[PDB]
């Protein structure tokens, strides 16, 4: 099934016309993510794109894909590889300027059972697989659906929560020094509009149930969290049956070879910590691994940086993590991941199954500009409370944190006013304990390793698998593009890295959304190639078609994205065919 010499070397004989040099060429990044997103990928991607768009047409049917006139029908020959025309005499990413030559066909192996283009494994089969896979397995009540899908497709979600999870950044040292205000705002968005809070990070969603499911919530707003968790765990359990036990080989046991959502050698999209990093480091010891942390080869990292260490605008290869909760704290531990494997295998099942169902494509990642986020954090106006007298709860009390006189513009206390919540003194002054864990710079990463033991010959590792992500940034909800009391693109900025979050309507927050490019963002997925590419990656737009137009009944898309996450690589048959 790897016998490709008859299609690789016998192919530098036929002729190749020209397409775009974008969705087939990769580059590197050295600066911060701000300008390389606002200035790069705007003016060159309005000169490289305007001639002959390519590879995005998926509206096709098995009646038109097979007619003799299909421009692609020539470059699809073996269901185990992704053939295409690309810039030749390139073997690495290189610079942000594509070289000159005649084109040349480099190869790559289609990884998951889903990468098969849409008019070959049509969505009908792809979502009929679910009823065999998930036959009578964990389904949730429809009222939780009515709540969560509302929350996702809401055009009014407050940015207070957006800034909230960009100022926690996962570590538990501050995670528990603010809980009064946190349950108060979860109640404030639940008991007011009947919609749960903090549904944008399975980090937070696994955090919460263990410390808000024991009294500081109502019995239902936390049971929805538990639904969203236990359904994830049921999908984790659905693959335990789709595996055979007794083929532990090269560190990776059979549990890792079946699903990509188990594959530690392909990193989750939004990881703040260093879990899968080290889970993967003892892996790939024969899988040609290499990393790219902001243009640099190696990486450094500290244990806890302080406020006096402000330096938001660093350049080196630093990857911050919160704090080691106990033990030793001085020159002792170069690095330790927090917990066992249950984190890096599980934190992305949410990402890649649950969010794409409720989103239907109504989501778009967003890197965060922090040089106005912590600056506009440490100026909360909170009323001192008399030593003898009690605290207020109403906004009419002239000494409540919310009263209509103490309102000073350009303050954090007003975000709650634009939110319609209740706060007190014990809730907001417990904020500035963040001087022990502060996130300086959102970054970009490139990680690569060869395939697993199932696709290792002398002529397949030269078709490496690239993976780009964004450390310490945010995956974002529906955008407004119609708000005024707050600006358009002044705090975050879209860095679309996953084809589940490549909305063009959410691209309208970058300075320079010219309408002559707003026409192309509507068709071609905006993806900076130094953080991901179409063919050379694992999740695809021909797979992302199964989340957009699949029109599932909202209980089948999840399980449908599961069997469509199995591999078609000669070893990957050994279990799935039993």
């Amino acid at each position: 099934l790897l016998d490709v010499e008859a299609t690789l070397v016998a192919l530098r004989q036929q002729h190749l016309d020209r397409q775009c040099y974008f969705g087939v060429y990769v580059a590197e990044g050295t600066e911060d993510t701000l300008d390389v997103q606002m200035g790069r990928f705007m003016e060159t991607w309005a000169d490289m794109m305007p001639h002959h768009p390519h590879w995005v047409n998926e509206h096709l049917t098995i009646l038109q894909f097979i007619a003799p006139s299909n421009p692609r029908l020539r470059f699809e020959l073996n269901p185990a590889f992704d053939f295409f025309v690309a810039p030749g005499d390139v073997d690495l990413p290189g610079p942000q300027r594509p070289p000159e030559a005649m084109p040349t066909v480099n190869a790559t192996l289609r990884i998951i059972n889903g990468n098969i283009p849409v008019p070959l494994c049509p969505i009908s089969f792809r979502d009929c697989r679910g009823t065999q896979l998930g036959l009578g397995r964990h389904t949730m009540t429809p009222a939780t659906i009515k709540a969560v899908k509302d929350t996702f497709e809401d055009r009014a979600y407050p940015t207070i929560f957006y800034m909230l999870e960009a100022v926690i950044h996962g570590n538990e040292r501050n995670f528990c020094a603010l809980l009064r205000l946190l349950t108060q705002c979860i109640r404030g968005y639940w008991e007011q509009s009947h919609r749960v809070a903090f549904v944008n990070n399975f980090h937070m969603l696994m955090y919460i149930t263990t410390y808000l499911g024991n009294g500081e919530l109502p019995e239902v707003c936390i049971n929805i969290y538990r639904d969203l968790l236990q359904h994830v765990r049921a999908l984790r359990q659905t693959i335990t049956d789709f595996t055979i036990q007794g083929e532990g080989h090269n560190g990776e046991t059979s549990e890792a070879l079946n699903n990509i959502l188990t594959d530690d050698t392909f990193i989750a999209p939004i990881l703040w910590d260093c879990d899968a990093l080290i889970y993967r480091d003892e892996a790939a010891r024969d899988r040609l691994p290499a990393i790219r942390v902001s243009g640099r080869n190696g990486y450094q990292a500290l244990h806890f940086v302080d406020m006096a260490g402000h330096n938001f605008q660093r350049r080196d290869n630093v990857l911050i993590h919160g704090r080691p909760v106990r033990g030793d704290t001085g020159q002792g531990i170069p690095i330790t991941p927090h917990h066992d494997r249950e984190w890096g295998i599980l934190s992305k099942i949410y990402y890649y199954i649950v969010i794409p169902a409720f989103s239907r494509g109504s989501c778009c990642t967003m890197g965060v500009r922090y040089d106005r986020l912590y600056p506009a954090l440490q100026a909360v106006i909170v009323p001192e409370i008399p030593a003898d007298e009690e605290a207020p709860t109403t906004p009419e009390d002239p000494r409540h944190p919310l009263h209509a006189h103490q309102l000073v513009p350009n303050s954090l206390n007003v975000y709650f006013h634009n939110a319609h919540l209740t706060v007190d003194g014990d809730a907001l002054l417990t904020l500035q304990e963040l001087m022990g864990d502060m996130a300086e710079r959102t970054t970009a990463i490139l990680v690569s390793s060869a395939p697993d033991a199932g696709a290792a010959t002398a002529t397949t590792r030269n078709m490496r698998i690239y993976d780009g992500a964004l450390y310490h940034g945010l995956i974002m909800m529906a955008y407004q593009a119609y708000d005024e009391t707050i600006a358009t693109g002044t705090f975050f900025y879209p860095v679309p890295v996953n084809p589940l979050f490549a909305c063009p309507e959410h691209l309208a927050s970058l300075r320079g959304m010219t309408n002559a490019r707003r026409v192309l963002a509507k068709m071609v997925p905006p993806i900076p190639p130094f953080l991901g590419a179409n063919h050379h990656a694992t999740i695809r737009q021909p797979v992302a078609y199964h989340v957009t137009h699949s029109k599932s009944d909202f209980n089948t898309l999840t399980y449908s994205l599961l069997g469509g996450y199995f591999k078609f690589t000669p070893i990957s048959l050994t279990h799935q065919l039993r």
């Binding site: 106005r372 600056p375 506009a376 906004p395 009419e396 002239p398 209509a404 006189h405 309102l407 513009p409 350009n410 303050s411 007003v414 975000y415 006013h417 634009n418 005024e484 009391t485 707050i486 600006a487 002044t490 705090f491």
Partner: protein, 100 residues
């Protein structure tokens, strides 16, 4: 009173009356003059001055309500000339102005 005065009000006498009072005063008198004294300036002149005149007569009728409320502030971006180092968030006006 000022019905027999050609273009004399012109937002030069209407501002004196209050808000509560002139609503009873406009519906007090009945007739224009027989020598059309209050006609040679068209009704689109008398009403054109009377609208802004009532606007003023109610504008200084609210010239006292200030020290029982809180001032109007900026409800938009309307970028600060000192925007650097500080992101300026607009305030939504929906509260109760009643300060005691």
């Amino acid at each position: 009173r000022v019905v027999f005065d050609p273009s004399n009000p012109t937002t030069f006498s209407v501002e004196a009356i209050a808000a509560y009072t002139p609503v009873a005063l406009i519906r007090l008198l009945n007739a224009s003059g027989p020598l059309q004294p209050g006609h040679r300036v068209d009704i689109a002149d008398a009403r054109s001055i009377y609208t802004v005149g009532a606007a003023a007569s109610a504008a200084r009728a609210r010239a006292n309500h200030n020290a029982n409320t809180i001032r109007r502030t900026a409800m938009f971006a309307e970028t600060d000339p000192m925007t650097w180092l500080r992101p300026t968030v607009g305030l939504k006006r929906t509260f109760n102005p009643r300060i005691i």
